[PDB]
Amino acid sequence: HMREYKLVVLGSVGVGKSALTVQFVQGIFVEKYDPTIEDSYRKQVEVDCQQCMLEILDTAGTTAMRDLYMKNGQGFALVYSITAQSTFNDLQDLREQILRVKDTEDVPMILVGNKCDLEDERVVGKEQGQNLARQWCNCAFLESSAKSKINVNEIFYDLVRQINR
Amino acid sequence: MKKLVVKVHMDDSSTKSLMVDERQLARDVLDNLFEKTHCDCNVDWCLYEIYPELQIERVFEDHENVVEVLSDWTRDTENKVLFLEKEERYAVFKNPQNFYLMNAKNKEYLLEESFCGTSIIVPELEGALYLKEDGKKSWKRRYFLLRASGIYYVPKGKTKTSRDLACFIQFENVNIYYGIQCKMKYKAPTDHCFVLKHPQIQKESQYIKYLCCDDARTLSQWVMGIRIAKYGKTLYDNYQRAVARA
Ligand SMILES: Nc1nc2c(ncn2[C@@H]2O[C@H](COP(=O)(O)OP(=O)(O)OP(=O)(O)O)[C@@H](O)[C@H]2O)c(=O)[nH]1
Ligand SMILES: [Mg+2]
Numbered sequence: 176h177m178r179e180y181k182l183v184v185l186g187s188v189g190v191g192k193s194a195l196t197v198q199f200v201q202g203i204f205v206e207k208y209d210p211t212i213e214d215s216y217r218k219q220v221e222v223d224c225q226q227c228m229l230e231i232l233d234t235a236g237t238t239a240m241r242d243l244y245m246k247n248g249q250g251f252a253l254v255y256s257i258t259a260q261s262t263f264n265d266l267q268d269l270r271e272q273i274l275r276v277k278d279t280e281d282v283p284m285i286l287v288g289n290k291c292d293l294e295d296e297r298v299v300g301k302e303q304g305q306n307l308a309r310q311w312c313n314c315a316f317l318e319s320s321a322k323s324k325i326n327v328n329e330i331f332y333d334l335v336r337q338i339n340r
Numbered sequence: 341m342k343k344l345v346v347k348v349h350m351d352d353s354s355t356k357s358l359m360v361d362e363r364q365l366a367r368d369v370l371d372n373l374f375e376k377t378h379c380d381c382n383v384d385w386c387l388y389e390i391y392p393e394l395q396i397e398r399v400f401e402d403h404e405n406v407v408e409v410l411s412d413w414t415r416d417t418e419n420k421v422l423f424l425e426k427e428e429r430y431a432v433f434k435n436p437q438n439f440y441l442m443n444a445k446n447k448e449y450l451l452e453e454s455f456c457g458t459s460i461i462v463p464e465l466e467g468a469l470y471l472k473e474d475g476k477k478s479w480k481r482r483y484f485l486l487r488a489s490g491i492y493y494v495p496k497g498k499t500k501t502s503r504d505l506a507c508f509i510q511f512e513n514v515n516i517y518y519g520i521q522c523k524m525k526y527k528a529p530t531d532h533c534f535v536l537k538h539p540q541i542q543k544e545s546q547y548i549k550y551l552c553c554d555d556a557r558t559l560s561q562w563v564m565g566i567r568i569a570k571y572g573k574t575l576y577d578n579y580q581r582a583v584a585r586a
C-alpha cells in the first residue's frame with residue numbers, strides 16, 4: 176500500500192491557501208475570493224519514485240478545532256502573502272502553536288511566501304522569509320504563485336520528503 | 341437568521357464545509373458547489389443524504405430547504421450530505437417513454453401532456469411488491485397501485501375501483517429513500533428496496549415502511565413514479581432549472 180500523508184495548509188485570511196491547494200490538486204486558478212471554513216482534498220502523486228496519497232486540509236484564515244488538525248497533521252505549510260506584511264508577522268504564533276501541540280521542535284514544515292507574481296505590490300522582501308527560516312533552524316522556504324504555478328507542486332512534495340526522512 | 345455549517349462529502353472522500361443559511365434551497369447549495377468543485381455542471385449532480393444507522397439514502401430535490409431537512413437530524417447524528425451524480429434523479433425527463441408506458445419531438449409531446457397541463461399525469465404504475473411486516477424479518481407479497489396522492493391497494497374481497505381503493509400511504513406524509521442491505525438485515529427477497537418514512541424519523545420505527553421489488557427495473561419505476569406523484573410540477577421545474585445550468 177502507498178503511504179498516506181496528512182498535510183495542513185495554514186495562514187492568515189486571503190494569503191492564497193485555497194488558491195495554492197486548488198492549483199496543486201486540480202490545475203485551476205481560483206480568482207474569486209470566498210473565505211474558507213474547512214476544505215479537504217485527496218490526491219495521489221509521485222514523490223521520489225513512489226506513489227503517495229496526500230490528504231490536504233485547507234484551513235480557515237481566522238480554538239479547540241485548530242488544536243485537532245495540528246495534532247492530526249503530519250506536515251504544515253505556513254503561508255503568507257508577499258503583498259501583506261501583517262500576514263507574515265502572524266506566522267510566528269502559528270509555528271509556536273504547532274510545536275507546543277506536537278510537543279516537539281522537529282515537525283515537517285515549509286514557509287511559503289505566496290503571490291510572487293505580484294512583484295509590483297511586494298512588501299515582504301525575500302530576505303525577510305529567509306531570515307525567518309533561519310530563526311526556525313533552517314525551515315524549508317519557497318516563494319510561490321498559485322496564479323503562475325511557480326513552486327506550487329514543490330510545497331507539497333517537500334513536506335512529503337520531510338515526513339519520509 | 342439561522343445559519344448552519346454543512347460538511348459536504350464528495351465521492352473521493354474530499355470535503356467542503358459550506359455556510360448555509362435558513363433561506364437556502366438545495367438548488368443554491370448546488371450552484372455554490374458547481375463553482376467550488378469546478379465540475380461539469382450536468383443535471384445528474386445532486387445533494388444526497390445518507391443515514392448510516394437506518395441504512396437508507398435519498399436524493400435531495402432541488403427545491404428543498406437544506407436547513408429544514410437537516411433540522412430533523414439528531415445531535416450526535418451519523419448522517420451525511422454528499423455531492424454526487426445520480427442519473428436516475430431526472431430519468432423521466434430524459435426518457436419519459438420509459439415510465440409512461442422515441443424521438444425528441446414525441447418525448448416533448450409526452451412531457452407537455454404529463455407535466456404542463458392543468459394537473460400532472462402520474463405514470464399508470466401498478467404491480468406486486470413485498471411489504472415488510474413491522475418489527476419482523478418477514479415479507480408479504482401484495483399488489484399496489486400508484487396514484488397522485490399515495491400508494492393504494494384493493495381491500496381483501498373487493499377489486500377494481502373507483503372510490504373503494506384503500507390507501508396504504510399518502511405521499512405528503514413521507515419521503516422516499518433507497519433501502520440498503522435489506523436482504524442481509526431483514527431477509528428481503530432482494531436488495532431492490534425502497535423505504536417510505538416521515539422526514540422526522542431518525543431511528544428504527546414501526547412507521548418506516550420497507551418495500552422490496554423483484555428486480556432493479558421495478559425499483560427504478562417505483563422510485564421515479566413516487567417522486568413524480570409527490571413533487572409533481574415542481575420536479576419538472578427543477579429539471580428545467582438544472583438544464584439551464586448544464
Ligand atoms: N495574483 C495572485 N493572486 C492570488 C494568488 N493566490 C491567491 N490569490 C488571490 O487572492 C485571493 C484570496 O485567495 P484564497 O486562496 O481564497 O485565500 P485563502 O488564504 O484561502 O483565504 P481564507 O480561506 O479566507 O483563509 C483570491 O482572490 C485569489 O485569486 C497568487 O499567487 N497570485
Ligand atoms: Mg481559503
